[PDB]
Amino acid sequence: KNIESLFDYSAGQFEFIDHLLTMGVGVHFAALIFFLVVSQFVAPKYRIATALSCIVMVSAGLILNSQAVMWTDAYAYVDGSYQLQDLTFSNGYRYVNWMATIPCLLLQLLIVLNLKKELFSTATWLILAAWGMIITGYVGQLYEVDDIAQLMIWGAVSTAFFVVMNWIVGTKIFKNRATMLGGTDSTITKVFWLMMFAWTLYPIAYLVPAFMNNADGVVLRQLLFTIADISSKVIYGLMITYIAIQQSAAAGYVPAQQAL
Template sequence: MSLATILSLNQYNIVYNVLSFVIATMLAGFIGFLLIRSSLPAKHRNALTLGTLVMAIADYHYFRIFNSFTAAYHIVGGKYVPTGIPFNEAYRYVDWLLTVPLLLAELVTVLELTPKESKVLISKLVVASSLMIALGYPGQISPVHSTARTLWAAASSVFFVYILYVLFVEIQKSLDKQPEGVRPLMFTLRALLLLSWGFYPIAYILPSFVGGATGIVVSQVGYSIADVVAKPLFTYFVYKVSKLKAEVEEKEEADLRSSLAA
């Protein structure tokens, strides 16, 4: 979707401030997760390590998105007019191409699967997510009311639905294997997954209905909200799952030592 549209002062500021907020959020997530990573036993750090890497990649790309957006506009007569420098939507898709597979692997890490099962599942999800993103990009840069945008969106949605279905099933299956106290957190992870991933198609589709400057704002803000929920917030709950699992294991080991000593 082209940003060659005049924006009002408020419309420009909404996108500007939201992008700025996401940059700060991703940076805070990166530093925070890096600092608390050592609080987990080594065997439970993998998921948080992946999440920390996601924060770093996302923060870099949001910085590039922010710079590209500000370069695409300048203020003239109280409105923001395109400068002629194109807004580079590819930064967002490159970010997703790198971070979505990492987020999926992050989730699989806490599903209580065998190493073989984890490897097979991650391989499937990485391929599906790569195809989903690669097929979505041509539609993103197509005119909002074009047939091409609809066709690319439909092709991308096939893999989108497949990923959600697989993860929903795998999370449900893993609940019986999880310690009792961890199960509510797994339900929360599943809810966050559905919530955040549900934002992406809305942000993709809505510009076709509202169009113009409003469509630009809806798209950029929608994607940004989805990324905050899907990355730092999701990773925080993955950390909570890992932390609780470590505490349960520590208690079980302590109980076992006590029983043997008795």
């Protein structure tokens, strides 16, 4: 059902996808140690934001690791090219995992924004819009080989949820940044633009079967996911952590003031 299963891969292409995924694991588990150790320097009001990055690191790290092992299980070097064997490789597992990682990324943003009834109501609408976007995207990617028109349609429905979700995010950011301490009102605007850039890479990767239906396209989609994953989880995570420690320090939390 996926474009990955259509082609044989050169040693170069196969190895590069393997390296990308393996690097992904490395980066997320390395970042996982950073967030764990710096969590002691975050005040109790914001400590869950740092804990959420740890959850994200392990979740994304486990899926990338599963993808890497599935990649190597599925293909073998036969007559000069990596060819598909008994098992299959699919990007479908990422979609399933986004059901958990996307709410996590959104929740840590809400915490550093100083959201408190307001927090539960905003989290529910965000998670429902996020699940709507993920589910419609998952259905759409089932047709990336058999029905391009269907991929485009479910993609349009997914984009509508993405846009409304982004509008909720931006509205809350640009409204609640005045509550933010230690000059983090400036930082949070950059986090908004970082999310807009990084999350927009996922629907681009989704559209790869439409404009680059070949093995090089398979490499590109994995490259795009790698850039997007590192930017949206790791880089985003580090900015959320800085915002949490800076605000904690401005709020009189001694470990944060000493660590800075």
